[PDB]
Design a protein around this motif. Structure first.
Motif, PDB file in Angstrom:
ATOM      1  N   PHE C 653       0.971  -1.069   0.291  1.00 18.18           N
ATOM      2  CA  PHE C 653       0.263  -0.250   0.205  1.00 18.18           C
ATOM      3  C   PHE C 653       0.551   1.279  -0.124  1.00 18.18           C
ATOM      4  N   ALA C 654       2.059   1.140   1.388  1.00 18.58           N
ATOM      5  CA  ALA C 654       2.753   1.958   1.261  1.00 18.58           C
ATOM      6  C   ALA C 654       3.334   2.671  -0.283  1.00 18.58           C
ATOM      7  N   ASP C 657       1.232   4.221  -3.152  1.00 13.90           N
ATOM      8  CA  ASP C 657       1.194   5.362  -2.470  1.00 13.90           C
ATOM      9  C   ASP C 657       2.078   6.546  -2.900  1.00 13.90           C
ATOM     10  N   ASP C 660       2.397   6.569  -7.156  1.00 11.27           N
ATOM     11  CA  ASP C 660       1.279   7.814  -7.327  1.00 11.27           C
ATOM     12  C   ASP C 660       1.841   8.879  -7.028  1.00 11.27           C
ATOM     13  N   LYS C 662       2.244  10.535  -3.521  1.00 13.50           N
ATOM     14  CA  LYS C 662       1.863  10.478  -2.889  1.00 13.50           C
ATOM     15  C   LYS C 662       3.277   9.941  -1.385  1.00 13.50           C
ATOM     16  N   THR C 783     -14.969  10.422 -11.250  1.00 13.04           N
ATOM     17  CA  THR C 783     -15.339  11.719 -10.850  1.00 13.04           C
ATOM     18  C   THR C 783     -15.452  12.722 -12.582  1.00 13.04           C
ATOM     19  N   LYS C 784     -16.432  12.732 -13.373  1.00 14.19           N
ATOM     20  CA  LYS C 784     -15.914  13.926 -14.740  1.00 14.19           C
ATOM     21  C   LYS C 784     -14.694  14.419 -14.365  1.00 14.19           C
TER      22      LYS C 784
ATOM     23  N   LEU D  86     -18.161   9.465 -24.035  1.00 11.27           N
ATOM     24  CA  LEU D  86     -18.435   8.910 -22.653  1.00 11.27           C
ATOM     25  C   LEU D  86     -18.525   9.897 -22.282  1.00 11.27           C
ATOM     26  N   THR D  88     -19.825  11.214 -18.438  1.00 15.83           N
ATOM     27  CA  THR D  88     -19.215  12.152 -17.392  1.00 15.83           C
ATOM     28  C   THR D  88     -18.999  10.670 -16.292  1.00 15.83           C
ATOM     29  N   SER D  89     -18.228  10.162 -16.112  1.00 14.09           N
ATOM     30  CA  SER D  89     -17.973   9.843 -14.988  1.00 14.09           C
ATOM     31  C   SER D  89     -16.246  10.354 -14.302  1.00 14.09           C
ATOM     32  N   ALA D  90     -17.395  11.006 -13.177  1.00 16.87           N
ATOM     33  CA  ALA D  90     -15.716  11.810 -12.683  1.00 16.87           C
ATOM     34  C   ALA D  90     -14.037  11.666 -12.648  1.00 16.87           C
ATOM     35  N   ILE D  91     -13.763  11.833 -13.243  1.00 13.51           N
ATOM     36  CA  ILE D  91     -12.085  10.933 -13.284  1.00 13.51           C
ATOM     37  C   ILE D  91     -11.325  10.912 -11.913  1.00 13.51           C
ATOM     38  N   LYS D  92     -11.517  10.382 -11.122  1.00 13.02           N
ATOM     39  CA  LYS D  92     -10.995   9.888  -9.697  1.00 13.02           C
ATOM     40  C   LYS D  92      -9.489  10.436 -10.072  1.00 13.02           C
ATOM     41  N   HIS D  93      -8.745  11.210 -10.251  1.00 13.84           N
ATOM     42  CA  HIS D  93      -7.267  11.502  -9.797  1.00 13.84           C
ATOM     43  C   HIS D  93      -6.682  10.826  -8.362  1.00 13.84           C
ATOM     44  N   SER D  94      -6.674   9.566  -8.564  1.00 10.58           N
ATOM     45  CA  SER D  94      -6.246   8.605  -6.706  1.00 10.58           C
ATOM     46  C   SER D  94      -4.943   9.076  -6.666  1.00 10.58           C
ATOM     47  N   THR D  95      -4.746   9.688  -5.717  1.00  8.64           N
ATOM     48  CA  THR D  95      -2.235   8.730  -5.577  1.00  8.64           C
ATOM     49  C   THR D  95      -3.385   7.128  -4.756  1.00  8.64           C
ATOM     50  N   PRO D  96      -1.951   6.297  -4.790  1.00 13.04           N
ATOM     51  CA  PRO D  96      -1.734   5.226  -4.584  1.00 13.04           C
ATOM     52  C   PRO D  96      -2.439   5.328  -2.741  1.00 13.04           C
ATOM     53  N   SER D  97      -3.121   4.944  -1.645  1.00 12.90           N
ATOM     54  CA  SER D  97      -2.457   4.878  -0.980  1.00 12.90           C
ATOM     55  C   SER D  97      -1.856   3.531  -0.882  1.00 12.90           C
ATOM     56  N   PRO D  98      -0.917   3.326   1.052  1.00 12.99           N
ATOM     57  CA  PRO D  98       0.533   2.140   0.385  1.00 12.99           C
ATOM     58  C   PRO D  98      -0.237   1.169   0.886  1.00 12.99           C
ATOM     59  N   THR D  99      -0.432   0.303  -0.353  1.00 20.06           N
ATOM     60  CA  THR D  99      -0.573  -1.125  -0.436  1.00 20.06           C
ATOM     61  C   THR D  99       0.635  -1.845  -0.500  1.00 20.06           C
ATOM     62  N   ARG D 110       8.297   2.008 -20.223  1.00 15.63           N
ATOM     63  CA  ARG D 110       8.069   2.564 -21.627  1.00 15.63           C
ATOM     64  C   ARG D 110       8.731   3.384 -21.333  1.00 15.63           C
ATOM     65  N   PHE D 111       9.098   4.762 -21.165  1.00 16.06           N
ATOM     66  CA  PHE D 111       9.055   5.607 -20.256  1.00 16.06           C
ATOM     67  C   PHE D 111      11.234   5.517 -20.678  1.00 16.06           C
TER      68      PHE D 111
END
Lengths: 56, 332, 798, 114
Positions: C653-654, C657, C660, C662, C783-784, D86, D88-99, D110-111
């Motif tokens: 998980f860390a 993050d 990402d 974070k 979310t859009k 396509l 309206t689905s709110a593109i959630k810019h999620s930063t990864p929680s520490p899994t 590739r970059f």
């Protein structure tokens, strides 16, 4: 092969310490053991059956 | 305390009538099929009468609803879907189907449940019960009787129960065939419509759509004629049921069950007028108006005495429906 | 319980005594007939159904059942009569038209009724193999007029079904019967026939036709003869491979002997200087010969004809000889890629198989290849090999093996980087076969190395996306490469566990994994059915009309792979997936690939945590009656291991993050786990923070932050060294060699300079403030897009 | 982005499918560069918002024209008519929680920073 007498007792005592009432659970655990002892003993061996209830 | 494995043994120490009743009330609370099988195994190991127990479980579940036969007003009440209480009465039959030796009792109890569902017009619940009975059950009942080395005819209860099960089958098959026919007749191919200023290309496209419609209508009509013949045969198998008529016992050497006898007479008064009206509706809509009028000869026949099951109101409605078919013959 | 004849008869008598009329007795006759049939009393069944038919003459089911009774008696003409009557009463019985045609052809092929019924059946079942067989039987009876019609029928069926082995064999036999040997050869040489090389009867027929052609043309130096000799060596090699897999040891010896003699016959025509296509094929087929000889020796040990110990060194020499055969040097001749690329694919397959088998047979002994060369790479060793394979059937002069030079063998151990390249070449010939993929995956697993499944899957499935945004979908069109990778990881692991449980009583000299031809099926028929459905759907190789059935198979088992509700997976499979994906993802230099692999790793950890809670509660895990992956109770997670897996989940998980961007949430998460792997990740974060601050002209504030980052890095690296000094077993849990931790600690000491060694501020006394709020690791719900442009991503992959 | 996608496809022996993708990337690049030039021609104040001098946009537009060759100047497919699907689905810019690290090894990044 070889040696049960100290580790199993510690594990069972530690499992019953996680139950909400270790006295009721001790009582409940003996219900199958009493029936099993009754079924293993013929009607001629009634005193060996009581000795097994005492041991349980 | 959910100590299921221990119960069968302690119940075996009770008097037989109390052991049966107490174990039956316990099994009524068991919904899981793997646990059901395990409890019957434990009952057998403990020397309990499994056959009397499973019978008592089914009887108790069947008796829990003393819902009076509702006096149905003449509304086409839409198929009242299978309730959770109906599901419990369907799933209790599984207890008697587990042991092949109980197939006669499974058949008797399934017929009793189907009698209630048919009187309430729950046709899908009655089919679900019917499908729980394995198709070999009749052959198995005869095989088990022959194996018991009895040169005597089957018990009059079991022979009447087999006959009753065959009556219910003929009725369910006729209702299913009618529902298939009724779905098909309400789904005719749509005649293509010409828009009132069509271009040359749209006229040629209409001629192609019209030829396609003529073909699709020919196929639809051929299937309608086949379904009409099948529904007609199946409804006649109910109206002209062999040897004493539909839901009538042939063996009188049984103990008197006044509740069963009353239910059979009630079902005849509900189902046979309905089947005659459905058959008239089939024949009238398929323009078989001459065969509509032959229903008067069938209903008035001394062989089947079908006129005795009609109310004076239903007989008037039938004669009015027959007159509608005679008017279409005069127009021809 | 079968009802006895006496029970049925008592039931019939009771049912007949209760019937009021003779008509009512006869109406029950169909039920009685079925009961008598279940009792095998066919005469009583016939009487009972005939008594029913006399009252219900228009019942098609009764006429069908009476036809079945006459068919069982061998009374074909009466059966056909009853079936015709059933078909007249109900024409919807298409199956009965086929059965009538079969029965008429069986009775008398010269019956003019047979053509009518076969043609009527042909209209009902276009392209049925059974109708093709009935038409073949009819036309085979008609002489020369039948020959032209049979030829046209075979061409039409080959157009509908080019890959039918039986129809292709019949075309060849029809050319041979008319002395048209050149057309039989031309048909065998067609490139579309490469798909039939998996069939033993086809390859044996091709070998027969080419030998007969070469015998008929002896004395004519034609270019066509060299091409047919080339394809004959290839077809002989296929017969050996297929016989090794599908037949016994004795038939495999005879197949290898015929291939040995074929190579010997060509050896005189191949001078070592001729860069001819035949010479290239001959040396390639020499490598395959030794690979198959080594496989035959291991097959003889598997059948208990010889002990493993006696055949390991001779088999290892054969794989060494096969491995060292040079690859065909491709000149890219612009214009006809189909012929020379195939020998290069065979060379890659030989080198992959032989190299992995050499590593398997060595059992990790360093000098093993040297000992084998000294013992067996001489004329005495050749004579021993010849005796093991052929006993006294072949002399040293009459054998290719006996006349071949094996003295020039290099002491070359297979390199793992070269083997990885050879494995990628071998995938082209096997076209994504699950047995081949599982076998390679097991070889890498026995080497304790992760198989390069990502490279293999990109080659097999070049159009499939790496990941999906819809893990909750079970739609077959939503499959990604990561779903296929976890499938292969679980197949390889379950195959490995199944080989271990079967090997607990096996000879210590037995190879851990056997060669592919003699290796048992490594996967279940359900795993096969799922993989073949996926492969057929994605490659568009699915048969017309089967695609709905294939989609249903895929949709069912895709729920299991994605760990959806009631997935029925064993926890040990989820741990293996999460670990495999973590290691693969961490080794990738691509930010997007790292994020996808870490995101999917974290998904399986989140699905595993509730199962670890059940194990902690000592609750049993639900097992499916038919699982996609078998449960192995020897790998059930112990209550002692639950904490280490919870800590590993927190690390994953860390790491997500961190990937990402974070960085602060990742620091807090790693500091919470208090493990060597978390301290290592913290040291790497603070080192990178220091390197981002390192620009040649820092303000005094940035110089203090740089020094603080290096002090924090030194602190965590020292904690790793202190824990390693207490428990040297920690070296197995570290992501890197302990030497790399020491090298980094000494570089950080050099950058801090000698002047700060005496002031340790108490590294842990001042962060005892912030109570318990469950850090919700939320993945963003969709979310859009609202574009707010004001944070350039600070994380470039240097 | 489309220029870099084209340069990643530019290897001296492309399959016909990779040649179509290369040309599509260059056409998309030409399209967006032309939109910048068209907006700059309408409002010269945009030069202050551009990350680069406008000269660099023109130099890149002329290099992309040279790589496309003169043969394609007359077929503009309507660059914006076909992506109206396509919702309206709110593109959630999620930063990864520490899994916790689960190593799945099968995507080499590739970059490379060239």
């Amino acid at each position: 092969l070889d040696s049960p007498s100290f580790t199993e007792d510690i594990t069972l005592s530690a499992v019953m310490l996680q139950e909400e009432d270790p006295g009721e659970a001790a009582t409940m655990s003996m219900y199958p053991d009493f029936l099993k002892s009754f079924l293993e003993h013929p009607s001629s061996a009634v005193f060996e059956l009581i000795e097994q209830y005492e041991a349980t | 305390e959910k100590q299921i494995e221990l119960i069968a043994f302690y119940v075996s120490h009770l008097p037989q009538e109390l052991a049966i009743s107490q174990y039956a009330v316990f099994l009524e609370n068991i919904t899981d099929p793997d646990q059901r099988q395990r409890c019957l195994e434990l009952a057998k190991e403990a020397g309990l009468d499994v056959a009397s127990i499973t019978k008592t479980v089914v009887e108790n579940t069947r008796k829990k609803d003393a819902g009076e036969f509702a006096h149905h007003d003449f509304a086409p009440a839409l198929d009242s879907g299978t309730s959770e209480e109906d599901r419990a009465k369907i799933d209790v039959i599984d207890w008697l189907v587990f042991d092949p030796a109980q197939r006669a009792e499974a058949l008797k109890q399934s017929n009793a449940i189907m009698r209630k569902f048919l009187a309430s017009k729950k046709h899908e619940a009655a089919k679900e019960v019917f499908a729980k009975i394995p198709q070999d059950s009749i052959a198995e009942i005869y095989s088990q009787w022959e194996e018991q080395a009895m040169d005597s005819a089957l018990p009059a209860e079991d022979d009447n129960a087999i006959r009753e099960h065959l009556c219910i089958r003929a009725y369910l098959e006729s209702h299913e065939a009618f529902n298939e026919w009724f779905k098909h007749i309400n789904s005719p191919p749509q005649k293509p419509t010409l828009v009132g200023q069509a271009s040359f290309t749209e006229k040629v496209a209409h001629e192609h759509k019209e030829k396609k419609y003529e073909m699709d209508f020919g196929i639809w009509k051929g299937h309608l004629d086949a379904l009409t013949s099948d529904v007609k045969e199946k409804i006649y198998n109910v109206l002209l049921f062999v040897d004493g008529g539909w839901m009538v016992d042939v063996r009188e050497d049984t103990e008197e069950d006044p509740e069963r006898s009353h239910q059979m007479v009630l079902l005849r008064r509900l189902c046979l007028p309905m089947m005659c009206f459905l058959l008239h509706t089939v024949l009238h809509n398929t323009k078989q108006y001459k065969d509509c009028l032959r229903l008067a000869d069938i209903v008035s026949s001394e062989n089947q005495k079908l006129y005795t099951v009609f109310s004076k109101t239903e007989m008037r409605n039938l004669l009015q429906k027959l007159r509608e078919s005679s008017l279409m013959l005069l127009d021809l | 319980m079968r009802r006895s004849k006496a029970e049925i008869q008592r039931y019939v008598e009771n049912a007949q005594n209760s019937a009021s009329s003779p008509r009512e007795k006869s109406m029950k006759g169909f039920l009685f007939a079925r009961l008598y049939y279940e009792a095998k009393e066919y005469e009583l069944a016939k009487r009972s159904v005939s008594s029913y038919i006399s009252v219900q003459e228009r019942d098609p089911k009764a006429h069908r059942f009476l036809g079945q009774l006459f068919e069982i008696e061998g009374n074909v003409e009466k059966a056909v009569g009853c079936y015709k009557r059933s078909l007249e009463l109900n024409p919807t019985q298409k199956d009965l038209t086929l059965r009538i045609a079969e029965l008429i052809c069986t009775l008398n092929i010269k019956d003019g009724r047979a053509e009518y019924w076969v043609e009527r059946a042909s209209k009902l079942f276009p392209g049925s193999p059974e109708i093709y067989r009935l038409k073949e039987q009819l036309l085979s009876s008609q002489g020369e007029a039948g020959w032209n019609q049979l030829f046209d029928l075979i061409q039409a069926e080959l157009f509908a079904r080019p890959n039918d082995v039986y129809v292709n064999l019949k075309l060849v036999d029809l050319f041979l019967s008319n002395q048209r040997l050149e057309e039989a050869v031309l048909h065998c040489l067609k490139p579309e026939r490469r798909a039939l090389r998996t069939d033993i009867e086809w390859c044996s027929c091709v070998v027969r036709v080419f030998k007969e052609y070469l015998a008929s043309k002896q004395g004519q130096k034609n270019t066509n003869m060299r091409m047919i000799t080339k394809e004959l060596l290839l077809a002989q090699c296929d017969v050996v491979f297929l016989t090794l897999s599908k037949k016994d040891v004795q038939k495999s010896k005879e197949a290898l002997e015929r291939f040995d003699q074929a190579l010997l016959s060509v050896k005189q025509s191949v001078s070592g200087t001729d860069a001819s296509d035949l010479s290239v094929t001959f040396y390639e087929m020499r490598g395959h010969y030794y690979m198959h000889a080594g496989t035959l020796l291991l097959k003889m040990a598997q059948s208990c004809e010889v002990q493993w110990k006696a055949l390991i060194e001779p088999a290892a020499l054969c794989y060494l000889l096969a491995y060292q055969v040079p690859k065909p040097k491709s000149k890219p001749v612009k214009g006809d890629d189909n012929g020379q690329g195939f020998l290069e694919e065979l060379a890659f397959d030989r080198q992959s198989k032989s190299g992995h088998l050499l590593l398997t047979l060595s059992h990790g002994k360093q000098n093993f290849i040297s000992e084998i060369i000294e013992t067996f790479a001489n004329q005495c060793g050749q004579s021993i090999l010849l005796k093991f394979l052929f006993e006294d059937n072949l002399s040293m002069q009459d054998s290719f093996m006996g006349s071949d030079d094996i003295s020039y063998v290099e002491n070359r151990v297979p390199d793992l980087s070269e083997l990885s390249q050879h494995d990628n070449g071998s995938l082209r010939i096997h076209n994504g076969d699950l047995q081949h993929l599982t076998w390679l995956g097991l070889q890498w697993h026995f080497l304790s190395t992760l198989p390069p499944l990502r490279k293999w899957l990109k080659q097999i499935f070049p159009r499939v996306p790496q990941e999906t945004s819809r893990l909750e979908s079970n739609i077959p069109e939503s499959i990604c490469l990561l779903d296929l990778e976890v499938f292969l990881l679980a197949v390889v692991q379950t195959s490995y566990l199944q080989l271990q449980d079967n090997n607990t009583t096996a000879d210590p000299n037995r190879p851990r994994c056997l060669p592919l031809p003699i290796c048992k099926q490594l996967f279940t028929d359900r795993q096969r059915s799922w993989w073949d459905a996926v492969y057929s759907l994605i490659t568009k190789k699915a048969l017309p009309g089967t695609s709905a059935k294939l989609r249903s198979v895929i949709q069912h088992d895709l729920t299991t792979l994605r760990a959806q509700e009631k997935h029925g997976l064993q926890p040990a499979v989820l741990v293996n997936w999460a670990r495999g994906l973590h290691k693969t993802g961490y080794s990738l230099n691509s930010f997007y690939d790292q994020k996808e692999y870490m995101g999917r790793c974290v998904h399986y950890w989140k699905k595993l945590l509730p199962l670890l809670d059940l194990v902690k509660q000592k609750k049993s895990i639900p097992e499916p009656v038919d699982p996609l992956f078998k449960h192995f109770h020897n790998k059930d997670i112990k209550v002692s291991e639950v904490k280490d897996l919870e800590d590993e989940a927190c690390i994953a998980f860390a790491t997500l993050d961190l990937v990402d961007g974070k960085t602060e949430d990742a620091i807090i998460a790693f500091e919470s786990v208090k493990n060597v792997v978390a301290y290592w990740n913290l040291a790497l974060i603070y080192q990178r923070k220091a390197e981002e601050i390192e620009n040649d002209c820092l303000p005094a504030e940035e110089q203090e932050e740089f020094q603080e980052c290096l002090l924090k890095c030194k602190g965590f690296l020292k904690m790793i060294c202190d824990e390693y000094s207490a428990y040297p077993s920690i070296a197995t849990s570290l992501p890197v060699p302990v030497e790399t931790v020491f090298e980094m600690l000494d570089s950080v000491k050099q950058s801090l300079g000698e002047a700060m060694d005496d002031h340790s501020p108490a590294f842990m006394e001042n962060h005892s403030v912030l109570t318990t709020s469950a850090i919700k690791h939320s993945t963003p719900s969709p979310t859009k897009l609202t574009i707010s442009p004001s944070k350039s991503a600070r994380f470039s992959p240097k």
